[PDB]
Design an enzyme around this catalytic site. Structure first.
Site, PDB file in Angstrom:
ATOM      1  N   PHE A 198      11.316   4.965   5.738  1.00 32.19           N
ATOM      2  CA  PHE A 198      11.283   4.052   7.024  1.00 32.19           C
ATOM      3  C   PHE A 198      10.840   2.576   7.046  1.00 32.19           C
ATOM      4  CE2 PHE A 198      10.858   8.980   7.734  1.00 32.19           C
ATOM      5  CZ  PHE A 198      12.018   8.881   8.286  1.00 32.19           C
ATOM      6  N   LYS A 240       2.639  -2.798   8.714  1.00 35.42           N
ATOM      7  CA  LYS A 240       3.396  -1.910   8.672  1.00 35.42           C
ATOM      8  C   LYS A 240       4.889  -2.445   8.883  1.00 35.42           C
ATOM      9  CE  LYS A 240       4.380   3.046  10.403  1.00 35.42           C
ATOM     10  NZ  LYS A 240       3.807   4.007  10.946  1.00 35.42           N
ATOM     11  N   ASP A 289      -0.605  15.216  14.182  1.00 37.70           N
ATOM     12  CA  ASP A 289      -0.588  15.000  12.815  1.00 37.70           C
ATOM     13  C   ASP A 289      -1.944  14.829  11.854  1.00 37.70           C
ATOM     14  OD1 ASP A 289       0.747  14.801  10.391  1.00 37.70           O
ATOM     15  OD2 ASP A 289       1.808  12.798  10.719  1.00 37.70           O
ATOM     16  N   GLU A 321       7.719  -0.144   4.673  1.00 33.91           N
ATOM     17  CA  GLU A 321       6.635  -0.255   3.706  1.00 33.91           C
ATOM     18  C   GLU A 321       5.198  -0.439   4.734  1.00 33.91           C
ATOM     19  OE1 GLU A 321       8.970  -2.350   0.328  1.00 33.91           O
ATOM     20  OE2 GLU A 321       8.178  -3.650   1.731  1.00 33.91           O
ATOM     21  N   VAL A 322       4.209  -0.458   3.919  1.00 33.11           N
ATOM     22  CA  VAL A 322       2.849  -0.766   4.661  1.00 33.11           C
ATOM     23  C   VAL A 322       2.243  -1.759   3.378  1.00 33.11           C
ATOM     24  CG1 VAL A 322       0.628  -0.223   5.277  1.00 33.11           C
ATOM     25  CG2 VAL A 322       2.700   1.292   5.619  1.00 33.11           C
ATOM     26  N   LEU A 350       0.592  -1.280  -0.080  1.00 34.74           N
ATOM     27  CA  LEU A 350       0.293  -0.020   0.100  1.00 34.74           C
ATOM     28  C   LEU A 350       0.795   1.416   0.131  1.00 34.74           C
ATOM     29  CD1 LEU A 350      -2.539  -1.194   2.785  1.00 34.74           C
ATOM     30  CD2 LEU A 350      -2.778  -1.343   0.252  1.00 34.74           C
ATOM     31  N   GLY A 351       2.066   1.039   0.280  1.00 37.41           N
ATOM     32  CA  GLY A 351       2.886   2.128   0.608  1.00 37.41           C
ATOM     33  C   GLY A 351       4.327   1.783   0.907  1.00 37.41           C
TER      34      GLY A 351
HETATM   35  C1  LIG Z   1      -5.378   1.867  -1.626  1.00 36.28           C
HETATM   36  C2  LIG Z   1      -3.855   1.992  -1.041  1.00 36.28           C
HETATM   37  C3  LIG Z   1      -3.634   2.147   0.461  1.00 36.28           C
HETATM   38  C4  LIG Z   1      -4.769   1.608   1.331  1.00 36.28           C
HETATM   39  C5  LIG Z   1      -4.555   1.502   2.749  1.00 36.28           C
HETATM   40  O1  LIG Z   1      -5.316   0.735   3.626  1.00 36.28           O
HETATM   41  C6  LIG Z   1      -4.913   0.827   5.042  1.00 36.28           C
HETATM   42  N1  LIG Z   1      -5.373   0.264   6.085  1.00 36.28           N
HETATM   43  C7  LIG Z   1      -4.878   0.554   7.385  1.00 36.28           C
HETATM   44  N2  LIG Z   1      -3.943   1.154   7.031  1.00 36.28           N
HETATM   45  C8  LIG Z   1      -3.286   1.952   6.187  1.00 36.28           C
HETATM   46  N3  LIG Z   1      -2.008   2.564   6.581  1.00 36.28           N
HETATM   47  C9  LIG Z   1      -2.253   4.090   6.901  1.00 36.28           C
HETATM   48  C10 LIG Z   1      -0.828   4.887   6.761  1.00 36.28           C
HETATM   49  N4  LIG Z   1      -0.533   6.085   7.017  1.00 36.28           N
HETATM   50  C11 LIG Z   1       0.541   6.919   6.964  1.00 36.28           C
HETATM   51  C12 LIG Z   1       0.968   6.788   5.488  1.00 36.28           C
HETATM   52  N5  LIG Z   1       0.168   7.541   4.438  1.00 36.28           N
HETATM   53  C13 LIG Z   1      -1.430   7.402   4.850  1.00 36.28           C
HETATM   54  C14 LIG Z   1      -1.872   6.911   6.246  1.00 36.28           C
HETATM   55  C15 LIG Z   1      -3.722   1.838   5.067  1.00 36.28           C
HETATM   56  C16 LIG Z   1      -3.243   2.130   3.614  1.00 36.28           C
HETATM   57  C17 LIG Z   1      -2.127   3.202   3.235  1.00 36.28           C
HETATM   58  C18 LIG Z   1      -2.477   4.261   2.379  1.00 36.28           C
HETATM   59  C19 LIG Z   1      -1.498   5.136   2.044  1.00 36.28           C
HETATM   60  C20 LIG Z   1      -0.027   4.651   2.183  1.00 36.28           C
HETATM   61  C21 LIG Z   1       0.211   3.578   2.869  1.00 36.28           C
HETATM   62  C22 LIG Z   1      -0.763   2.744   3.399  1.00 36.28           C
HETATM   63  C23 LIG Z   1      -6.041   1.307   0.688  1.00 36.28           C
HETATM   64  C24 LIG Z   1      -6.301   1.297  -0.399  1.00 36.28           C
END
Ligand SMILES: c1ccc(-c2oc3ncnc(NCCN4CCNCC4)c3c2-c2ccccc2)cc1
EC number: 2.7.10.2
Length: 271
Positions: free
Chosen positions: A26, A43, A134, A28-29, A21-22
């Site tokens: 630091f 995470k 934040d 990945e997620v 997802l990211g």
């Molecule tokens: C498509 C893409 C991602 C998700 C997506 O679903 C999620 N579910 C729970 N936690 C998450 N992490 C939040 C992290 N925060 C810190 C990083 N920035 C965002 C919030 C994400 C993310 C996510 C979004 C953006 C970056 C990393 C992870 C759902 C659909």
């Protein structure tokens, strides 16, 4: 408690990372599954990118802040690579969701509904003597049922006395941060309230960057004059005035999150 006694520690084998997802400096997620059937967010900390203790500090704050409106800590794997597993939100970040075909079609009614949901979460944080620091649309996650939850507790802090003072070198997003925080490094729940005001503009403009056409220096200059963000396009006036309350000069003059929740709920049940 020690990991062999901690309710949150889980064997890494219980996790299957499926979709990223990211990715960042630091770590990945990912989107994954716990014990095969339960969708989770994982995470992972990039070894050496930052202190493991700093990373895990967020998961322990999360142990103390459990509520339906806050992304829930699920578990942790304290052996490198370190993992923090949490509740999964199907529709991602609010700032992103509002830009999708579904987000774009939302009525002002539903936007106010979400705004209140966010205030509700913050009201809980408020009552538990914690601050977020934040608070922005990028840190609000959206569920498959279009419900919103507060996320990213990296900067969150338990407030023992009225305020928290950051590090002189610490830097924060100028556009979302309250004046007193920008100028003195002093954060209180009232600083979060100011941020909530900016977040509201993010909601009504479906993710637009606050203070359109202005640099950070310009924003500070204008604020010092007593000006506040210009009315966003198609922003209901009552909501704008609620935003104004959040941007009052004196932190103590800004409303509580419970007040904000109550008002937003009325705005919602009216529209
Ligand atoms: C498509 C893409 C991602 C998700 C997506 O679903 C999620 N579910 C729970 N936690 C998450 N992490 C939040 C992290 N925060 C810190 C990083 N920035 C965002 C919030 C994400 C993310 C996510 C979004 C953006 C970056 C990393 C992870 C759902 C659909």
């Amino acid at each position: 408690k020690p990991w062999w006694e901690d309710e949150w520690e889980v064997p890494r084998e219980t996790l299957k990372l499926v979709e990223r997802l990211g990715a960042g400096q630091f770590g990945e997620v990912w989107m994954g599954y716990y014990n095969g059937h339960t969708k989770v967010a994982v995470k992972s900390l990039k070894q050496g990118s930052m202190s493991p203790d700093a990373f895990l500090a967020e998961a322990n704050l999360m142990k103390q802040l459990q509520h339906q409106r806050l992304v829930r800590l699920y578990a942790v794997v304290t052996q490198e690579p370190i993992y923090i597993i949490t509740e999964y939100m199907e529709n991602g970040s609010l700032v992103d969701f509002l830009k999708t075909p579904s987000g774009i079609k939302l009525t002002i009614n539903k936007l106010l509904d979400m705004a209140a949901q966010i205030a509700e979460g913050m009201a809980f944080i408020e009552e538990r003597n914690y601050i977020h620091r934040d608070l922005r649309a990028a840190n609000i996650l959206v569920s498959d049922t279009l419900s919103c939850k507060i996320a990213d507790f990296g900067l969150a802090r338990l407030i023992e006395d009225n305020e928290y003072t950051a590090r002189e070198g610490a830097k924060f997003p100028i556009k979302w941060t309250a004046p007193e925080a920008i100028n003195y490094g002093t954060f209180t729940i009232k600083s979060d309230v100011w941020s909530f005001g900016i977040l509201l503009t993010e909601i009504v403009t479906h993710g637009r960057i606050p203070y359109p056409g202005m640099t950070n220096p310009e924003v500070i200059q204008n604020l010092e004059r007593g000006y506040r963000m210009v009315r966003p396009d198609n922003c209901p006036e009552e909501l704008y005035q609620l935003m104004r309350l959040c941007w009052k000069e004196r932190p103590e003059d800004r409303p509580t999150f419970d007040y904000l929740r109550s008002v937003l709920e009325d705005f919602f049940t009216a529209t």
